[PDB]
């Protein structure tokens, strides 16, 4: 095992054994189990100890394997990051010379590169840190030396270009969060001044040098630099011309040249139009040279290798970006019209590529073009831009219809300790893709609705006669047809959908076999669901569709029933009104007929389909406006499940032990699920059904609670794996879901509070408190949370009872550690936020000890790791502070008792790395606190210093706290930081960046103005900020 | 026989350990046990062209419990840079992890996975994940517990690595 | 009953309501004479009268009425004249 | 998997098809889907149909199911295509493997123009396909579903006039789907129960007698009065 | 069930409906109903074959299946012309004209 040899690596009292260190480092990457565990542990401990110099200066020399030298470089980078400005200048110069010597020795050994590529890269990174901390003043000649060494030889020039790339990255793209704002500004200014010296070396190596590795490295460097290069160098030189001519038309340079051209095109300046025009023209010429207009781009991509695919994608990116940015310019340039059309054809061909990313990239520009054209004029198909683009739109529409992401997204998920359901996704990547395609297609239809009609008709007919028959094609065409909905005037929609339905029914009759029949059934069922506007004008057709759906729900073939139920509910939602009225030529509203047949329609559907169908019916009932008719409707509507409910209730009354019968529990769960869906759909009037079962519902909930608690006691947590336990927990969750849902839908808060609320407090809260912690139901808290959210103040009186019931027992679950019972934490803090935001006076009334415990809970909240919990805690705290501003009577006492502790806790959290996510909330809270302080509040936070204005005592207190936390900070640092807090009080973004800046400094053993403080610069920034917040 | 290694990167609170735990044993985990250092998890897959195995390395995404930082990446042939769609900041840190990765890798196959799309509060709006494009990265919307797209990252990595565009799991 | 006389002089006897089907007969309404309807068509129209009045408002399917193609033209002419 | 002439018909460009017909020996040539190019010409446009018919294109070209181009021309309601194909000598009563005559397919859509033309060329109305449906049966099934408008009403009027008489009460009762539309089931039942005026029966007998020729020109040679021949052309 | 009979004699023509069980005597009263000729003075024939007045319609050469209201059955009738059974003579209907050219078969 060799742990006895291993633990010596931390023995810093003796010289390092380079051989053993290298062996352990290599075994890390070639070890397992305890070997890897303790290896990484020892290495991490080793990297932390102070004597890093003795270890580095030895590893980099006597290390055999490369990764060991890499680890030594990592240690030295830690040293350079932490203790740089406090090293003796002797060691500073020694380190600088040692690293530059190592770099020169390693880089020039071969002509361009060696197996040290990672090792030389990390050497470059070390030198880049040194440069970050020493460049603008201690090495005012480094840039000139780099340029000279570059001109001297290529084995130095390539590595110098790598160095420059790394430095430009670190200085212009990765500064925030790792370098102070003022230091970053200084470095960027220095680079702006020193670029040209680099630029001429770049131009030399680009136009005269011919070492392909070197030129590729230079192109990468230019790409990176382009993110910030002053535009004078870019557009006012020959750089674009050189790129296009000498590097876009050779396999190993075209990728990088195209990336650079893309970055150049993305610029949005207005006075560089001619440079853009020339760029586009030359680029198109070159593209025609390498990529002819008639190439089979799709086959090329499928068969092509990484380079070809990357070139295709980057061609797409360049075209899309340049067009989105300046296409109007070329469109105005008459002579280039042919090139414009050729570029459009390029993007057409690329669009055929089967890669999703490339298709999305092209679709982005397509959507932009369509939206721009629609804005140009809202009327359908003369507008100038539209007049120009018209010829392409035909192919655009053809592609849009041939390819169309499926709108649906259905998944099978198992939850509740083993219960499987079906779920739908809202805005995953695929759904967004479909949304973009649909939006573009709708715009295009608004342009040429007639052409869309013709294309869709032709594709459908092609499916009919078997010429293009294929399930994939049929589904895609149906999704495309559904994509447009109301896109055309309802008369044209009438004609188009009539034709489509006739053709689809004809195809259904023509084909045969269960598979084809099922596919076509799903297809038409989808199409109809997406056209409620047509259905609401054709009562006969709507009735026929509903009847056919009823017929389908008896089908046993998989897929038919689920789609049938989904279509039925979709139709009910958008057509609820017509089912509850007598249509022309009808005797009774169609709802009445449906209700009478509920018995047999669902005779074959599985429980989930049953719930969905009941939800659809409920949606249908809600449209009813007559209260008495609605009540009769609801009575008959819930008649059926109520019978089983009452039977089970009577059986339980005869003997409650039936509740341990799994079948009865499952039936109860199904009944409650049905009721939940009905409550969701019907809305407030559903109370009539609720009252009929409220009391026995709560009673059975209590009985199941008792049963589950006893089972857990006798068997422990493991018994939750028992399906019976799963079933009771189901029943409970669904009961709570019903109650919370109805309360959400209810709109008579006083009636709810005085009728339905107290029974919960009786039979749920004390239950929760009594239950063993493991079996306590987290959803319990959410119900009261929603009840409070809806009732507002009307529930205030019972807040103390609710809290005495649940609050004390909840915290003991979530105070021992940060991890366990997360759902409990989320629900509890949601409840607390609701109470604070709506029932604040309750907090004033409860004993001060309870309020103290609440504040402790809030602090524990925003001290958590999970970002949601922390954000909830911070929001609760901010709302609490806001509210207390009105309770002036107790406001002063609350300040005196908690303000200093809260401020301490906020600074504690901010000064920690694991909570940068809530930086904005921290800034807001601190700004509010300091506004309270400075603007003036009556009391004084410290009795001995009663005459001492808080504006001074708090400054001193916070300075002392920061010093205690971080001794190595210079007094000037802390004093400036605290003064800025007041100065940056009203400029919340400035306050946030100031907090981040301070967070940067604490990580380093900063020096005594040793290139870190820039005190005079900060003074000017803060003093005007103090003036800024002043006015 | 074929063998590789895999390193996971991405700031904490984005499901780095849950993916590997699920693929190893299949059942979800809720507790946010912060990862320490790196854990070696031997992993296996079966395909139409046989079995391929990943030695998965789980790098903690917390600055306070990370360990060796980039040194873990030295021998890796593939990695997933993951974040969370619900936590916007986790996305803003993706470029930082990408940089820290490439500098020690030769543009190896890397997949960007946006976790926790099952949550209905999609703070990280789609239509604003354009970064993965310009770095030739393969992007997947994923979820550890709902299993949405739960196999696409591994499948795509296997296709690009073993070198067989017809590869498929079974 | 009513007696129908054809153009060729043939005489046909049919009860009133049966023969009453023709609108020309209703306008006429105990004898009717036709200058243009030959016997072979008068018998055909009488058979049609009995056929219709037998199957009028018939729940069961009505068997087809056989017609000789040779007589078809004058049969149609007679039907129009009688507007049966 | 298709000849260039078939693709030209796909685009249905008269110039392309007519210039490719210089090779027109392939005009009656099958392809991957067994669709003779005349089928596509009928599906798309009348000009292609005409030009193909000029160069000896077979009007009754079969396919994988024998659905002659006339069937497709009717199904698409390409009135001019249908009339041209028939005038050139297409089998008005061409039978597919299901015996679905072109009139049956025209009714399937309730398209008035093609049905009118097919009747005008003496199409058979009393045909019954293998599944047992009939033109009027399918047109009614369309009306049950509530689709269509006054156009389908006129199409049903023309079919009712043509068929002379018809019955729908299979086994003495209406089909289930029709039953759910009492305000239409009553109309259908009263139509079924009414024996039909003798004039209509005589009209049908005459129309059968004439046969397959173009009737309205054919009737011109008849001695029947102008109004009554118009009636024979289903003007009432 | 019932059957429809076509009664003819010379140019005369009479239509009626008779049940199968109906006796030919019943048809004799039916003739009497419009004709002053008594029943004994009437004798009926099926294609010249004398019909027994006592015979029932069902057992004779007439039945509903054989004759329909659209397709009746001809019945020959004779009087006692000069106190003697006149030889049966049914005057045929005028021969139909000749089919025009258009309507000849294909
Ligand atoms: N909504 C949702 N949450 C998930 C999913 N997977 C994991 N989580 C949550 O995210 C946390 C993931 O923790 P880890 O596995 O350690 O991954 P991490 O968040 O990146 O933490 P580190 O590995 O230490 O960096 C879990 O505690 C879960 O609560 C998921 O698929 N959907
Ligand atoms: C044609 C015949 C059919 O019913 N096919 N489906 C199956 C599948 N499995 C067993 C038995 N039959 N056909 C297919 N679809 C339709 C049709 C569906 C619908 C919809 F509402 F369900 F989408 C409506 C209609 C309508 F509107 F009534 F015409 C028809 N018919
Ligand atoms: Mg983890």
Swiss-Prot record, chain A:
GO terms for biological process: cellular response to salt; cellular response to triglyceride; mRNA export from nucleus; negative regulation of transcription by RNA polymerase II; nucleocytoplasmic transport; protein export from nucleus; protein localization to nucleus; regulation of centrosome duplication. Keywords: Acetylation, Cytoplasm, Host-virus interaction, mRNA transport, Nucleus, Phosphoprotein, Protein transport, Repeat, RNA-binding, Transport. GO terms for cellular component: annulate lamellae; Cajal body; cytoplasm; cytosol; intracellular membrane-bounded organelle; kinetochore; membrane; nuclear envelope. Residues 391-461 are annotated as: Interaction with RANBP3. The modification N6-acetyllysine is found at residues 426, 673. The modification Phosphoserine is found at residues 430, 1011. Residues 39-105 form the Importin N-terminal domain. PROSITE patterns: IMPORTIN_B_NT. GO terms for molecular function: DNA-binding transcription factor binding; nuclear export signal receptor activity; protein domain specific binding; RNA binding; small GTPase binding. It comes from the Eukaryota. It is found in: Cytoplasm; Nucleus, Nucleoplasm; Nucleus, Cajal body; Nucleus, Nucleolus. This is Exportin-1. It comes from Homo sapiens (Human). The lineage of its organism: Eukaryota, Metazoa, Chordata, Craniata, Vertebrata.
Curated annotation (Swiss-Prot), chain B:
The keyword GTP-binding applies. GTP binds at residues 11-18, 61, 115-118, 143-145. It comes from the Eukaryota. Residues 30-38 are annotated as: Switch-I. Its main location: nucleus. One of its GO terms (cellular component) is cytosol. Signal peptide: none annotated. GO terms for biological process: exonucleolytic trimming to generate mature 3'-end of 5.8S rRNA from tricistronic rRNA transcript (SSU-rRNA, 5.8S rRNA, LSU-rRNA); nucleus organization; poly(A)+ mRNA export from nucleus; protein import into nucleus; regulation of cell cycle phase transition; regulation of nucleocytoplasmic transport; ribosomal subunit export from nucleus. GTP-binding protein involved in nucleocytoplasmic transport. Required for the import of protein into the nucleus and also for RNA export. Essential for cell viability. By analogy with Ras, Ran may be activated when GTP is exchanged for bound GDP by RCC1 and inactivated when GTP is hydrolyzed by Ran upon activation by RanGAP1. Found in a nuclear export complex with RanGTP, exportin and pre-miRNA. Forms a complex with YRB1. Interacts with BUD5, CEX1, RRP12, SRM1, and DIS3/RRP44. This is GTP-binding nuclear protein GSP1/CNR1. The gene is GSP1. The chain holds residues 10 to 179 of 219 of the full protein.
From Swiss-Prot, chain C:
The keyword Electron transport does not apply. This is Elongin-C. SIII, also known as elongin, is a general transcription elongation factor that increases the RNA polymerase II transcription elongation past template-encoded arresting sites. Subunit A is transcriptionally active and its transcription activity is strongly enhanced by binding to the dimeric complex of the SIII regulatory subunits B and C (elongin BC complex). Core component of multiple cullin-RING-based ECS (ElonginB/C-CUL2/5-SOCS-box protein) E3 ubiquitin-protein ligase complexes, which mediate the ubiquitination of target proteins. By binding to BC-box motifs it seems to link target recruitment subunits, like VHL and members of the SOCS box family, to Cullin/RBX1 modules that activate E2 ubiquitination enzymes. Component the von Hippel-Lindau ubiquitination complex CBC(VHL). Ubiquitinated by the DCX(AMBRA1) complex, leading to its degradation by the proteasome. Overexpressed in prostate cancer cell line PC-3 and breast cancer cell line SK-BR-3. One of its GO terms (molecular function) is protein-macromolecule adaptor activity. The lineage of its organism: Eukaryota, Metazoa, Chordata, Craniata, Vertebrata. One of its GO terms (biological process) is regulation of transcription by RNA polymerase II. One of its GO terms (cellular component) is cytosol. Belongs to the SKP1 family. It is found in: Nucleus. Pathway: Protein modification; protein ubiquitination.
Swiss-Prot record, chain D:
One of its GO terms (biological process) is protein ubiquitination. Residues 183-236 form the SOCS box domain. Pathway: Protein modification; protein ubiquitination. ANK repeats lie at residues 1-29, 33-61, 65-94, 98-127. Its main location: cytoplasm. The SOCS box domain mediates the interaction with the Elongin BC complex, an adapter module in different E3 ubiquitin-protein ligase complexes. One of its GO terms (cellular component) is cytosol. It is found in: Cytoplasm. The keyword Repeat applies. The gene is ASB8. Interacts with TBK1; this interaction promotes TBK1 proteasomal degradation. The keyword Transit peptide does not apply. Highest level of expression in skeletal muscle. Also expressed in heart, brain, placenta, liver, kidney and pancreas. Keywords: ANK repeat, Cytoplasm, Phosphoprotein, Repeat, Ubl conjugation pathway. It comes from Homo sapiens. This is Ankyrin repeat and SOCS box protein 8. Phosphorylated by TBK1. Belongs to the ankyrin SOCS box (ASB) family.
């Amino acid at each position: 095992l060799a742990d006895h040899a291993a633990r010596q690596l931390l023995d810093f009292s003796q010289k390092l054994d380079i051989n053993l260190l290298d062996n352990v480092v290599n075994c890390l990457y070639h070890g397992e189990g305890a070997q890897q565990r303790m290896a990484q542990e020892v290495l991490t401990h080793l990297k932390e100890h102070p004597d890093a110099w003795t270890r580095v200066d030895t590893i980099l020399e006597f290390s055999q394997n490369m990764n060991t030298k890499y680890y030594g470089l990592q240690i030295l980078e830690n040293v350079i990051k932490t203790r740089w400005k406090i090293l003796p200048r002797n060691q500073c110069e020694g380190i600088k010379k040692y690293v530059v010597g190592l770099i020169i020795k390693t880089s020039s050994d071969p002509t361009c590169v060696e197996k040290e590529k990672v090792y030389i890269g990390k050497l470059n990174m070390i030198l880049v840190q040194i440069l970050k901390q020493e460049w603008p003043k201690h090495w005012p000649t480094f840039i000139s030396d780099i340029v000279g060494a570059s001109r001297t030889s290529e084995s130095l020039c390539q590595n110098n270009m790598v160095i420059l790339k790394l430095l430009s990255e670190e200085v212009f793209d990765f500064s925030s969060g790792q370098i102070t704002q003022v230091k970053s500004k200084h470095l960027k200014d220095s680079m702006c001044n020193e670029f040209s010296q680099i630029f001429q070396l770049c131009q030399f190596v680009m136009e005269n040098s011919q070492n392909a590795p070197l030129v590729h490295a230079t192109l990468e460097t230019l790409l990176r630099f382009l993110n910030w290069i002053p535009l004078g160098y870019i557009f006012e030189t020959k750089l674009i011309s050189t790129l296009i001519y000498k590097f876009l038309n050779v396999p190993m340079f075209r990728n990088v040249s195209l990336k650079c051209l893309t970055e150049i095109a993305g610029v949005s300046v207005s006075q560089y139009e001619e440079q853009f025009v020339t760029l586009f023209t030359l680029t198109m010429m070159q593209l025609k040279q390498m990529l002819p207009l008639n190439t089979n781009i799709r086959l090329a991509y499928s068969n092509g290798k990484d380079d070809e695919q990357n070139f295709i994608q980057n061609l797409s990116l360049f075209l899309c970006t340049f067009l989105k940015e300046h296409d109007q310019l070329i469109e105005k340039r008459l002579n280039l019209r042919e090139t414009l059309m050729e570029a459009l054809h390029y993007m057409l061909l690329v669009s055929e590529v089967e890669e999703t990313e490339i298709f999305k990239i092209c679709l982005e520009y397509w959507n932009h073009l369509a939206a721009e054209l629609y804005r140009e004029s809202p009327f359908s198909t003369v507008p100038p831009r539209r007049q120009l683009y018209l010829p392409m739109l035909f192919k655009v529409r053809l592609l849009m219809v041939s390819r169309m992401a499926k709108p649906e997204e259905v998944l099978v998920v198992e939850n509740d300790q083993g219960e499987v359901v079906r779920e739908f996704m809202k805005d995953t990547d695929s759904i967004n893709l479909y949304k973009n395609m649909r939006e573009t297609l709708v715009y295009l239809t608004h342009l040429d609705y007639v052409d869309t009609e013709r294309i869709m008709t032709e594709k459908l007919h092609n499916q009919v006669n078997g010429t293009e028959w294929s399930w994939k094609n049929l589904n895609t065409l149906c999704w495309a047809i559904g994509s447009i909905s109301g896109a055309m005037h309802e008369e044209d929609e009438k004609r188009f959908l009539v034709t489509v339905i006739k053709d689809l029914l004809g195809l259904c009759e023509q084909k045969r076999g269960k598979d084809n029949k099922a596919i076509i059934a799903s297809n038409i069922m989808y199409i109809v669901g997406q056209y409620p506007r047509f259905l609401r004008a054709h009562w006969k057709f709507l009735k026929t569709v509903v009847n056919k759906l009823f017929e389908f729900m008896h089908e046993t073939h998989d897929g038919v029933q689920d789609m049938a139920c989904d279509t039925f509910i979709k139709i009910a939602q958008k057509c609820r009104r017509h089912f509850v009225q007598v249509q022309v030529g009808e005797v009774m509203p169609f709802i009445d007929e449906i209700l009478n047949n509920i018995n047999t329609i669902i005779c074959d559907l599985q429980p989930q389909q049953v719930h969905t169908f009941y939800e659809a019916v409920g949606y249908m009932i809600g449209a009813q406006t007559d209260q008495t008719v609605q009540e009769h409707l609801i009575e008959k509507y819930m008649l059926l499940p109520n019978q089983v409910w009452d039977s089970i209730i009577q059986q339980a009354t005869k003997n409650v032990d039936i509740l341990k019968d799994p079948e009865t529990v499952k039936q109860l769960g199904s009944i409650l699920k049905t009721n939940v869906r009905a409550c969701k759909a019907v809305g407030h009037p559903f109370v009539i059904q609720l009252g009929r079962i409220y009391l026995d519902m709560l009673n059975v909930y209590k009985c199941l609670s008792e049963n589950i608690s006893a089972a857990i006691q006798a068997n422990g947590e493991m018994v939750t794996k028992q399906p019976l336990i799963r079933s009771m927990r189901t029943v409970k969750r669904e009961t709570l879901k019903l109650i919370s849902g109805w309360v959400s839908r209810s709109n008579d808060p006083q009636m709810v509070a005085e009728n339905f609320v107290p029974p919960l407090l009786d039979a749920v809260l004390i239950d929760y408190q009594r239950n063993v912690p493991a079996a306590r139901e987290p959803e319990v808290l959410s119900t009261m949370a929603i009840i409070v959210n809806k009732l507002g103040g009307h529930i205030t009186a019972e807040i103390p009872q609710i809290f005495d019931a649940v609050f004390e027992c909840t915290l003991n679950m979530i105070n021992k550690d940060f991890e366990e019972y997360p759902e409990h934490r989320t629900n509890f803090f949601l409840l607390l936020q609701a109470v604070n935001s709506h029932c604040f006076p309750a907090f004033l009334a409860i004993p001060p000890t309870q309020f103290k415990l609440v504040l402790d809970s809030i602090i524990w909240a925003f001290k958590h790791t999970m970002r949601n919990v922390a954000d909830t805690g911070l929001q609760i705290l901010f709302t609490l502070l806001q509210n207390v501003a009105q309770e002036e009577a107790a406001a002063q006492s609350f300040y005196q008792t908690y303000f200093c502790d809260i401020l301490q806790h906020i600074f504690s959290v901010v000064t920690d790395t694991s909570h940068t996510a809530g930086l904005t909330m921290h800034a807001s809270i601190l700004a509010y606190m300091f506004n309270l302080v400075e603007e003036g509040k009556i009391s004084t936070s410290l009795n001995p210093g009663n005459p001492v204005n808080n504006q001074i005592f708090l400054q001193e207190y916070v300075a002392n706290l920061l010093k205690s936390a971080f001794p190595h900070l210079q007094d000037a640092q802390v004093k400036l930081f605290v003064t800025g807090l007041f100065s940056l009080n009203q400029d919340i973004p400035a306050f946030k960046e100031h907090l981040r800046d301070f967070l940067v400094q604490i990580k380093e053993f900063a020096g005594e103005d040793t290139s870190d403080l820039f005190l005079e610069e900060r003074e000017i920034a803060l003093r005007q900020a103090d003036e800024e917040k002043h006015k | 026989v074929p063998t590789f290694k895999l390193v996971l990167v991405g700031d904490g609170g984005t499901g780095k350990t849950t993916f590997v735990k699920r693929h190893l044993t299949g059942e979800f985990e809720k507790k946010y046990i912060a990862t320490i250092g790196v854990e070696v998890h031997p992993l296996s897959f079966y395909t139409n062209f046989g079995e391929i195995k990943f030695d998965v390395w789980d790098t903690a995404g917390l600055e306070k419990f990370g360990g060796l930082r980039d040194g873990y990446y030295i021998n890796a042939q593939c990695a997933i840079i993951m974040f969370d769609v619900t936590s916007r900041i986790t996305y803003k840190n993706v470029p930082n992890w990408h940089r820290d990765l490439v500098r020690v890798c030769e543009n190896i196959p890397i997949v960007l996975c946006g976790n926790k799309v099952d949550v209905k509060e999609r703070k990280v709006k789609a239509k604003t994940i354009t970064f993965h494009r310009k770095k030739n990265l393969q992007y997947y919307d994923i979820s550890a517990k709902s299993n949405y797209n739960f196999e696409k990252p591994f499948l795509w990595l296997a296709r690009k690595l073993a070198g067989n565009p017809q590869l498929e799991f079974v | 009953y009513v007696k129908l006389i054809s153009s060729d002089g043939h005489e046909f006897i049919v009860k009133r309501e049966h023969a009453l089907t023709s609108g020309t007969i209703k306008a006429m309404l105990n004898e009717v004479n036709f200058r243009e309807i030959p016997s072979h068509v008068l018998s055909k129209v009488c058979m049609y009268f009995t056929y219709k009045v037998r199957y009028t408002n018939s729940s069961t399917e009505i068997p087809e009425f056989p017609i000789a193609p040779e007589i078809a033209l004058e049969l149609l002419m007679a039907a129009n004249f009688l507007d049966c | 998997t298709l000849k260039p002439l078939h693709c030209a018909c796909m685009v249905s460009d008269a110039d392309c098809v007519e210039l490719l017909l210089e090779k027109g020996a392939e005009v009656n040539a099958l392809d991957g889907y067994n669709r003779t190019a005349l089928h596509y010409a009928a599906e798309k446009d009348e000009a292609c149909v005409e030009v193909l018919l000029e160069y000896g294109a077979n009007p009754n070209a079969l396919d994988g199911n024998r659905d002659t181009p006339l069937h497709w021309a009717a199904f698409k309601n390409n009135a001019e295509c249908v009339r041209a194909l028939l005038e050139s000598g297409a089998s008005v009563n061409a039978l597919d493997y299901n015996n679905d005559t072109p009139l049956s397919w025209a009714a399937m859509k309730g398209n008035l123009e093609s049905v009118s033309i097919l009747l005008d060329y003496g199409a058979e109305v009393r045909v019954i396909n293998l599944i047992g449906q009939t033109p009027i049966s399918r047109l009614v099934a369309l009306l049950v579903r509530g689709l269509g408008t006054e156009k389908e009403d006129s199409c049903f009027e023309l079919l009712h006039r043509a068929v002379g008489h018809f019955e729908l009460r299979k086994n003495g009762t209406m089909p289930r789907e029709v039953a759910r539309d009492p305000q239409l089931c009553e109309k259908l039942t009263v139509l079924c129960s009414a024996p039909g005026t003798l004039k209509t029966l005589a009209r049908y007998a005459v129309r059968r007698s004439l046969g397959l020729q173009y009737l309205p020109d054919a009737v011109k040679g008849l001695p029947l009065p102008a109004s009554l021949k118009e009636y024979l052309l289903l003007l009432e | 069930m019932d059957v429809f009979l076509m009664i003819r004699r010379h140019k005369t023509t009479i239509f009626t409906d008779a049940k199968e069980s109906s006796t030919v005597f019943e048809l004799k009263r039916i003739v009497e109903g419009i004709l002053k000729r008594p029943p004994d003075e009437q004798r009926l024939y099926k294609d010249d074959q004398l019909l027994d007045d006592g015979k029932t319609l069902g057992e004779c050469g007439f039945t509903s299946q054989t004759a329909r209201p659209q397709a009746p059955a001809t019945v020959g009738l004779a009087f006692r012309a000069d106190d003697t059974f006149e030889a049966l003579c049914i005057e045929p209907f005028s021969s139909p004209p000749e089919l025009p050219d258009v309507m000849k078969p294909q």
